[PDB]
Design a protein around this ligand. Sequence first.
Ligand SMILES: [Mg+2]
Ligand SMILES: [Mg+2]
Ligand SMILES: [Mg+2]
Ligand SMILES: [Mg+2]
Ligand SMILES: [Mg+2]
Ligand SMILES: [Mg+2]
Ligand SMILES: [Mg+2]
Ligand SMILES: [Mg+2]
Ligand SMILES: [Mg+2]
Ligand SMILES: [Mg+2]
Ligand SMILES: [Mg+2]
Ligand SMILES: [Mg+2]
Ligand SMILES: [Mg+2]
Ligand SMILES: [Mg+2]
Ligand SMILES: [Mg+2]
Ligand SMILES: [Mg+2]
Ligand SMILES: [Mg+2]
Ligand SMILES: [Mg+2]
Ligand SMILES: [Mg+2]
Ligand SMILES: [Mg+2]
Ligand SMILES: [Mg+2]
Ligand SMILES: [Mg+2]
Ligand SMILES: [Mg+2]
Ligand SMILES: [Mg+2]
Ligand SMILES: [Mg+2]
Ligand SMILES: [Mg+2]
Ligand SMILES: [Mg+2]
Ligand SMILES: [Mg+2]
Ligand SMILES: [Zn+2]
Lengths: 62, 91, 50, 69, 101
Amino acid sequence: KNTLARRKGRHMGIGKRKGTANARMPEKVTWMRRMRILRRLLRRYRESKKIDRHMYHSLYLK
Amino acid sequence: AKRTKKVGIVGKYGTRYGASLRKMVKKIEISQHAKYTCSFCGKTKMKRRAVGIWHCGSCMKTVAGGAWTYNTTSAVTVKSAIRRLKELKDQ
Amino acid sequence: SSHKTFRIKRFLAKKQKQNRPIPQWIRMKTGNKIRYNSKRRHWRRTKLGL
Amino acid sequence: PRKIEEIKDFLLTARRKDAKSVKIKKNKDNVKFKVRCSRYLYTLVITDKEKAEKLKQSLPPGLAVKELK
Amino acid sequence: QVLKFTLDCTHPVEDGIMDAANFEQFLQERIKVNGKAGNLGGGVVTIERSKSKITVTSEVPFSKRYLKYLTKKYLKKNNLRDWLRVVANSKESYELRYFQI
RNA sequence: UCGGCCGAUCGAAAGGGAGUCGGGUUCAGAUCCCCGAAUCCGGAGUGGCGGAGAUGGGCGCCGCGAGGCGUCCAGUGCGGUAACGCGACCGAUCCCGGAGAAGCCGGCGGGAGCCCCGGGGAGAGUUCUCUUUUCUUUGUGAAGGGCAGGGCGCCCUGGAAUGGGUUCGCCCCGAGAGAGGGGCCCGUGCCUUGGAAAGCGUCGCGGUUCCGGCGGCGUCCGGUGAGCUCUCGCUGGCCCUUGAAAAUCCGGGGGAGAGGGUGUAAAUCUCGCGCCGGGCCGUACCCAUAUCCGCAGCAGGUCUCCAAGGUGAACAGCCUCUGGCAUGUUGGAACAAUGUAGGUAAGGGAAGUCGGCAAGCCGGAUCCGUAACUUCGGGAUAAGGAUUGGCUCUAAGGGCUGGGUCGGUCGCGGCCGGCGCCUAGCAGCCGACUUAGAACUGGUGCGGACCAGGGGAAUCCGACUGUUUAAUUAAAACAAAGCAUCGCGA
RNA sequence: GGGCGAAGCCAGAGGAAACUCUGGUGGAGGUCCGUAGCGGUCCUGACGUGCAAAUCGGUCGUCCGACCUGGGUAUAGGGGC
Ligand SMILES: [Mg+2]
Ligand SMILES: [Mg+2]
Ligand SMILES: [Mg+2]
Ligand SMILES: [Mg+2]
Ligand SMILES: [Mg+2]
Ligand SMILES: [Mg+2]
Ligand SMILES: [Mg+2]
Ligand SMILES: [Mg+2]
Ligand SMILES: [Mg+2]
Ligand SMILES: [Mg+2]
Ligand SMILES: [Mg+2]
Ligand SMILES: [Mg+2]
Ligand SMILES: [Mg+2]
Ligand SMILES: [Mg+2]
Ligand SMILES: [Mg+2]
Ligand SMILES: [Mg+2]
Ligand SMILES: [Mg+2]
Ligand SMILES: [Mg+2]
Ligand SMILES: [Mg+2]
Ligand SMILES: [Mg+2]
Ligand SMILES: [Mg+2]
Ligand SMILES: [Mg+2]
Ligand SMILES: [Mg+2]
Ligand SMILES: [Mg+2]
Ligand SMILES: [Mg+2]
Ligand SMILES: [Mg+2]
Ligand SMILES: [Mg+2]
Ligand SMILES: [Mg+2]
Ligand SMILES: [Zn+2]
């Protein structure tokens, strides 16, 4: 029951947090997810001919 | 962004050991951990394995060099001198 | 311990065998002068030599 | 254990000198013929039933034909 | 796509400690289909009796353990829980019998 | 003729070291007994059975052809461009190499076990009202075969700048990228033989004073993840530190030799199966607030493995499940002083005291905001300030598939094509947590327990981290890097 | 279990260059807070014919390193260390 409430956002707040924001959700893990999601999208765009090699390589570095 | 003004690689030592000792070890630690261009394969992969031992990852060539640099200025003049004396020795 | 040598195990075997009461018929012998086994040993009170 | 694939290999396996016994296990889906040799238990799996019944009468004589049901 | 579960009220009705008519009268308003009690979810779940056998036939995914949950709820309401006991006598079938001393 | 372990021997129940697992069984033993499945090493002299070696061409003849006879010549296997593969695949002394055989730390990824979620069963719990509810349970060993999956600094084609590929980070490439196609290793995962006959859960029926009794049914389908623990792998960092040895096993180089005259053949065989054997010693139990040491059933000491739910950053603290226990060598009745341990205290706030000793204040997280000084790294959580509950929402952060212009037709379906423009990207399905914002709301209470820095200005000493008088001194003492001096060419 | 965030790297901006600034990434250190462990500051607390011939309570120091620890070895008395 309490887990279902926490899905909707209850009991999260500011007075319910004891660990650091990085201890609760690490920045390195957040960066990995973002890199994996974005690099996957760029790859799928390259093999579907939406972008070429040169636009892919510019955006990969970006 | 540039993270430190002057300590660079010796920022790992904190406030310890003295500024001049950290400055002294700074240039040695930079050359100790640098990757040199291998003179056998041409790749920039010749890195220190142990003190005096320099190994290339590509051609797997191991060279005996200096403690902190790939070659010492002492040994370079010696190689030039030995070459000069050898060509003087024969005719 | 559980790991033991044969010589130690044989030593412990003899100590078990001689740690028993005297037979009741000993006291009926002529001129016995023995009341009880005075060399009885308990594992917790006194420890073995080894 | 070893799994015998086709029918013929099971016959000369059961006709070996070290074959102690053959067990027949009738499952819901198949019939298994397990002959106990010296090193391995050789199992032959028969999907249907007419071939399993045919194999039952074709077994070499003088060998234990223990049924597991 | 037909479930056809069965409830067997034989031993208690022959001892007269309860009647299958009332137990049938208990089920049709307590059975929930898609979370809604009453009207059997639009009549999709049907109910009938053989004077001892109460069978539940459904055309939607419907759990057998729900009948045991509902039957145990009836027995507690009628103070029969300390004598009777719902036991799965087979698949698609439940049967309530006495505690064996 | 060849032959250096160039040195006996001992030295590890945590190093090296072939090969046993599942089920049952006792009052007390089991990876040891029983049942069932394997496996390692050693042996087979009279050679145990197969298979391999290895059994083909040439010429004369006969023979309608096919096929038979004689003679001669081969034959210590074969396939793939390659990586390498196939069931064997002659070979000594000698030589070369490998494995054994290697630190610590970081970050990722694969696999398992556990945890979690959604259903289907079986049995229980609650039912005052509600709860399709809550709880329990819902197997497949070793060893083979096959297939996933992971890895490769392996091969072939080809030749790349408008450089490209690519990681969380990196890193890689004319010494051969990308791409296409292959090969190898690991395979603890899945399926299969083992295997359901066993085990387990339920519901029954008989009894052999104490049945591995008999029987019915079931042992199902999914989804998740920076989760935890093992394990496997990849890639880095650190070292004036470079993190054993030896038994033992294997591969290669070389070709001394051996084997037969064309035979149902030989030498030989790391291939399949079959036969025999594996001796000696240890093995119970405790392993600690009672089986050990401390004189004792002593609040001390004594090396390890496994490790659930909630909260939470968490192996914290607090509560709980499995498992365990009986409060630590006694109880009863009262509730004096003094004590030991723990709290509170109006007003004042160190006036107490050698001395703020002791206690108290602060404390988590978020958003701001941070001085002198400084070896420029720090100081720094400086200092200082605001907020924190509950409830109802709103945004944002992903993954999977499918996008056809159609009968011109028959393999209400399939091979090509006249047959069309998602190209500002849509449609459906599934899915974790996390952040931000808003409204409402309670006697302003909200890190509500637990967890959890008081701060600033200076002076002395020691640079720091480290160490020290076990049992009255942890310090400014010792050590330290740095600096300097001295001896020494064997 | 958290904090700080060294080198290396990416992007953007400013620069004639030299280079500089900003945002990320990365994860160093006889680094910090703090478990287990190791130690033993203060109460000059408890106890002081004790639980104990050195223990106990709270509070403490350190907690990736000159770290903690088992077993096997070596050094023996004017000697060892
Ligand atoms: Mg004792
Ligand atoms: Mg020895
Ligand atoms: Mg036992
Ligand atoms: Mg199985
Ligand atoms: Mg390539
Ligand atoms: Mg069964
Ligand atoms: Mg034992
Ligand atoms: Mg004790
Ligand atoms: Mg003693
Ligand atoms: Mg006691
Ligand atoms: Mg008490
Ligand atoms: Mg008591
Ligand atoms: Mg007061
Ligand atoms: Mg006051
Ligand atoms: Mg005063
Ligand atoms: Mg005074
Ligand atoms: Mg104080
Ligand atoms: Mg300050
Ligand atoms: Mg609010
Ligand atoms: Mg000091
Ligand atoms: Mg100083
Ligand atoms: Mg000490
Ligand atoms: Mg002392
Ligand atoms: Mg000085
Ligand atoms: Mg530290
Ligand atoms: Mg610290
Ligand atoms: Mg002291
Ligand atoms: Mg005292
Ligand atoms: Zn090189």
